[PDB]
Amino acid sequence: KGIVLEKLGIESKQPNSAIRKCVRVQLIKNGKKVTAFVPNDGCLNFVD
Amino acid sequence: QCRVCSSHTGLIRKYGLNICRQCFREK
């Protein structure tokens, strides 16, 4: 588990064609920055 | 025409035979 850094910038390693509502996150056990994902996608409203 | 087409161009009222100018080489 880790904090969400921010909204994510899409760099094409193919193919799902949208800004995928993904989350730049950085963990707290380590602090090593990983791009993440949510399924059931959309609903970009309900956490900071 | 004779009922095996939807023929709308080059229509015929002449002489009751219903065979087109484009249909002397088909019909």
Added chain:
Amino acid sequence: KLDTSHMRYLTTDDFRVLQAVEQGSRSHEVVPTPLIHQISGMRSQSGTNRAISDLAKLSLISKMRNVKYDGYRLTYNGIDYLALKTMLNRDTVYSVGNTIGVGKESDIYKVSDKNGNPRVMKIHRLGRSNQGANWMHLSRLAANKEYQFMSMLYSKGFKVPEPFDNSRHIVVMELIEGYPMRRLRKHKNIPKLYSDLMCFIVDLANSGLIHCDFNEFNIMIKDKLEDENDCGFVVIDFPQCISIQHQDADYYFQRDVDCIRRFFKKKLKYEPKPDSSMLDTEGFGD
């Protein structure tokens, strides 16, 4: 015949594509299916076969379903619409049409520029159209070669109109409000302009290209100035141009002496005054 009204349904989806595929159909004639995306870097399935089925009816591309060598071809509008699109891309044509004029491989299409003064989109389609292996190869390059051979006396002090762009079949020639020698009625200085027909081929031998082809449609007393009628010469005499090395100048040189003798005499019953000139001077004074 002609279609024009199959173009304005598109988006950016074909604008990155064109001169990548136009330089890509030349590098690699008939293009198969999954390459329109990947010549232009367009993405695989974000508005793609929607846009290619949009292009499909428009006759600038066609679905040539051959056996695993498929065809997407940039029919005859793959040059024609897409050179209209190219002049939209090369900043000359902003919309299509105020156009009147008919030839075979030169249609006069009267347009207004980026400036606002008019010019003419002449279009090249020979064989009518017959556009095939060399016919497309001609109208691509005879738009390019005759972009190079309409300046042979403009630099040298004489009157040849100037070409502007050579997009795929299109040659843009100001526009010339001519008056050919079948339209005119009278003249104010007759005997100057008969001996200047010996003397124009004198001028043509300076540049090394003798032109002959003079019918009654040729020499336009044009409109440079409208009000005071400072006219000029447009000399539609070009395509009988012959390299003088070839063995036909025995009857090209003698045309310069005794073949123009009818038109200022008969058309303009008035038997003429002036002298003449040969081209024996122009053999040395190039």
Added chain:
RNA sequence: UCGCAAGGCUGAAACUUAAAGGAAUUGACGGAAGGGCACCACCAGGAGUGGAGCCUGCGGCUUAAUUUGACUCAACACGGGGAAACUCACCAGGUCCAGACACAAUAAGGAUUGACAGAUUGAGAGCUCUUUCUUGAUUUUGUGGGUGGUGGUGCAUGGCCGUUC
């Protein structure tokens, strides 16, 4: 490590991939052309265009109207359309006429019917029954299922012959 050197010997990971590789084969397209054999093409020239007035036929201007489209599939037939109002696919203005089937208001004191007499006219008409009187039970209407598919474009299904072979 070995060599004066150039290099020689031993040899990874970070990352990225749905592939890289082996031999083997079937037939489109040629920028291969043969012969045909075609005078709907070529040589010898005829008829003659190519310069013009018009029938006949369109793309263009102009429209309430200067209609229209595919088959031998295109530069063509004008679709027997050379044309009169009709033709003739469009136009300048009007109305004969929509509620049946159930029950609900009036239903035979006139709901709504007709062999007729007028007003009749909108740009020129038949139609109506308020102002003779057939009416004959029946049918008038704010309504919805939709019986009304005299909306079939059809989706193919069943032979049958234009078409494709």
